[PDB]
């Protein structure tokens, strides 16, 4: 299946409270594996997945030196952006970035990407061709021009295509027991009464992995997609995920509805009834 290596970077200024807070979080698929926080007592890139213990001390020294470099780089960016937007030095501002690469089952590259945002709004992003940039506004146009003359896309492309890909393959190998496992969901339904002779049927899917799953409610074989409440899949604290979907039905008509659970850890879908 596809696999990805992603890094979420966030730089937040905080006038009057010192230097900006800087954080970097790394993920291999839906699994947090590394993290860096500048507010930490002792800021160092630390492991978040047990399989990362296979990396020598020179790994952590390199990643930490790198992060501290990124931190300074972003402090500058927060100053520059105030200029571009004619803003004051008194407010708090945020820069977010996502960078990554995705590979297929055979380990070849599917795609690479890097996107920036300022104050929760798109700023500049690398195009699919991995050669050109696209700016969301006038300010981003200034950066686009600077980056085109300095030839940044070629350096970045070297990373997304090589380094990112090769290290991703290594992580999947060293941590295959964790990253290549499959936990099957365990489902159940709950009943809650409401006014006007109606009820809320909720179907729960628990402790599964990977995060991708499909939960549907059915009546007469038709998947009731319009009239169905649902929550985004969420982590449950131990590396697995959970999700639920509910439907309000006429009192005493409960048995006419069923819940179907589709997941790669299920040879045949689960069908539940209350």
């Amino acid at each position: 299946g596809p696999h990805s290596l992603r890094y979420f970077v966030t730089a937040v200024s905080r006038p009057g409270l010192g230097e900006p807070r800087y954080m970097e979080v790394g993920y291999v698929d839906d699994t947090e594996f590394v993290r860096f926080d500048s507010d930490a007592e002792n800021p160092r890139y630390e492991p978040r997945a047990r399989w990362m213990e296979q990396e020598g001390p020179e790994y952590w020294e390199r990643e930490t030196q790198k992060a501290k470099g990124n931190e300074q780089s972003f402090r500058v960016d927060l100053r520059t952006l105030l200029g571009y937007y004619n803003q004051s030095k008194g407010g708090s501002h945020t820069i977010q970035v996502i960078s990554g690469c995705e590979v297929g089952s055979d380990g070849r590259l599917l795609r690479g990407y890097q996107q920036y945002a300022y104050d929760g709004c798109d700023y500049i992003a690398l195009n699919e061709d991995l050669k050109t940039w696209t700016a969301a506004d006038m300010a981003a146009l200034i950066t686009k021009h600077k980056w085109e003359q300095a030839g940044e896309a070629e350096r970045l492309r070297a990373y997304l295509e090589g380094t990112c890909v090769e290290w991703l393959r290594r992580y999947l190998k060293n941590g295959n027991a964790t990253l290549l496992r499959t936990d099957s969901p365990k489902a159940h339904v709950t009943h809650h009464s409401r006014p006007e002779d109606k009820v809320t049927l909720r179907c729960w899917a628990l402790g599964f992995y990977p995060a991708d799953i499909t939960l549907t409610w059915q009546l007469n074989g038709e998947e009731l997609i319009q009239d169905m409440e649902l929550v985004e899949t969420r982590p449950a604290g131990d590396g697995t995920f959970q999700k639920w979907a509910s439907v309000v039905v006429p009192l005493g008509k409960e048995q006419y509805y069923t819940c179907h659970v589709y997941h790669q850890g299920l040879p045949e879908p689960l069908t539940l009834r209350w």
């Binding site: 890094y7 890139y45 790198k66 990124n70 780089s73 920036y116 600077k146 970045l156 990112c164």
Partner: peptide, 9 residues
Amino acid sequence: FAPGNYPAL
């Protein structure tokens, strides 16, 4: 393996 040399805006 995190990226470095993030170009300045």
